[PDB]
Symmetry: C2
Subunit: 310 residues, 2 copies
């Protein structure tokens, strides 16, 4: 008390965070469910899109891009996709990401933030970040370089490299932060801070962001997968509404924006790049992707160093 | 030292798929490519001595001043460019670099395509996974060649490793069934002479989308600081040795791109890409190919086996 930790079904909250929209599609692209904010940011209104083809809802270019993406052999758990609608109004572009799960195709839409951000310049800077990281030659220094790069690209107040021990307790082994915030370097945390069902989720889905912990959830309606007759599994949805217990925990330490990226050493959860901001901090899909690439390169380095000996 | 002698860094010309402008440190226009009127409606004659502010829009001028002002590294970076002009305004995909006391801008008209080229992140994520699963140098190079071919669509992608005498061997390859294999062939050092090699050690990417291009003169071809021809070593548009052009014409490949594989300071090898037809490589693509080369070189280093 609390020892009910592992029991919360965090993957089926029936709701998302309000900063994007979510549509759930059948394989033939009929809309089966949608976030209740679909009228505002866009159409009008769920009961109105339900049963319509997503293809009569978005762009001709978007439908083509999605058909290409979904035909691409080798699963992948989805990817970015540029999305546009034209409506009675009414022409909007979104940063989309799709994914397949639970026998549905999900489309999440985020309005493009930060306001350019020339992508060619951003790719070049990502390459340079990767170069600095790959030049580190010890575990702490690779971890510190990783935290510095992520901090640089995301502007987060405090970026921490959290390493799991064999019992899933953990320690902050590297950190880059603004001098105004507290250091967590060297601090140890028990396993129950990230309970077993979260660790499972974070092994299969390596990126999460909660830009404002004080958000009001938006329901997904109907919250019923027609393929299962049960609530829709939002495990792979970037917009998934998270456990209220975690949000209380964040409020408790005074950080209203958070993101973390799993560091996967093979198929195993080695640690996290954990990021805290004092106020809300929205991070574009492109920047989240750069942070994922950083964790991927860092994981590879960690493995090479682990194979050293002997 | 005979194939060594061609002054490849000073051709006084570029390839016609972009334009080049050269600016003094105070941003006045020093020189530009003769296709300015065709691509922009403005003449070089009307541009020499004029300020960058007086020529590009304010947002471009800002981006560029900020990029150049950034302290520390970078020979250069990508930049989005628009022109001020009475006839209106045109957007270009830009890079700048600094070299020989000049600042260069290279600009290409924006991509217009019926096709859907692949995305930087997905392509790099997938390439690292594959490289990482590899357990030998040869398999790591083959994964690199296969990823670069997938990203680019090139008919043949080869990993060319230099020996200590700077001869070379194609140690991995991916190709379409329609073109011959070069896998396991050795080539003499003369195929990439000493001055090209030195260039390719400091400037790691080269692209010749159409080897039968009509070179476009840079005017004036005279650096005001230096009284010598404009040094285009870091220009991605530089017009390339016509000897190397004929070398490709002779093997029927009309589009090429290569990326250096660098091991610290040493030119270790090339990712060499051949296409039968001209091949204009998407800008996101060339960056992904560059990152593949950097991660491969790291991996080659690891397999070399530690910390000096
Ligand atoms: C009994 C329930 C508890 C609990 C539940 C819980 N916690 C999470 C998710 C996270 N917990 C995190 C822990 C840390 N962040 C840090 O910075 C550090 C130390 C440096 C630790 C130990 C992290 C990073 C997450 C991921 C989310 C994020 O990045 O902010 C969940 C799952 C939330 C969700 O995905 O729905 C749950 C159920 N935490 C507890 O302390 C006890 C009371
Ligand atoms: C005496 C002059 C000769 C000569 C000159 C030359 N060659 C280059 C540049 C390249 N040569 C290349 C060689 C290969 N490409 C391949 O695929 C293979 C086989 C696997 C080989 C040996 C390459 C890759 C380049 C870089 C350009 C590219 O990627 O297409 C230059 C310099 C061109 C320039 O940068 O201006 C010169 C002067 N080559 C000869 O064979 C003799 C006759």
């Amino acid at each position: 008390d609390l020892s009910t930790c592992d029991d919360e079904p965090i993957h089926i909250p029936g709701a998302i965070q309000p900063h994007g929209l979510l549509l759930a599609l059948a394989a033939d692209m009929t809309i089966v469910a949608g976030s209740d904010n679909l009228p505002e940011l866009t159409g009008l209104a769920i009961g109105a899109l339900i049963g319509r083809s997503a293809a009569d809802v978005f762009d001709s270019e978007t439908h083509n891009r999605l058909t290409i993406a979904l035909a691409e052999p080798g699963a992948a758990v989805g990817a970015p996709i540029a999305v546009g609608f034209t409506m009675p109004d009414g022409e909007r572009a979104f940063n989309g990401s799709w994914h397949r799960h639970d026998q549905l195709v999900f489309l999440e839409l985020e309005p493009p933030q930060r306001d350019v951000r020339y992508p060619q310049a951003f790719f070049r800077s990502v390459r340079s970040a990767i170069r600095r990281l790959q030049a580190a030659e010890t575990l702490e220094s690779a971890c510190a370089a990783a935290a510095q790069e992520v901090r640089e690209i995301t502007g987060f107040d405090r970026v921490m490299i959290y390493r799991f021990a064999s019992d899933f307790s953990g320690e902050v082994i590297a950190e880059d932060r603004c001098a105004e915030v507290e250091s967590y370097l060297g601090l140890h945390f028990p396993a129950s801070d990230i309970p077993a069902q979260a660790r499972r989720l974070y092994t299969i889905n390596p990126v999460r962001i909660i830009p404002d912990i004080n958000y009001r959830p938006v329901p997904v309606t109907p919250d019923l997968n027609p393929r299962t007759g049960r609530p829709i599994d939002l495990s792979f949805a970037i917009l998934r509404s998270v456990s209220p217990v975690h949000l209380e925990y964040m409020r408790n330490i005074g950080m209203h924006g958070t993101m973390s990226i799993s560091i996967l050493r093979g198929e195993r959860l080695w640690g996290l790049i954990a990021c805290h901001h004092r106020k809300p901090n929205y991070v574009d899909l492109e920047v989240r992707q750069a942070c994922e690439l950083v964790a991927q390169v860092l994981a590879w380095q960690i493995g090479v160093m682990e194979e050293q000996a002997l």
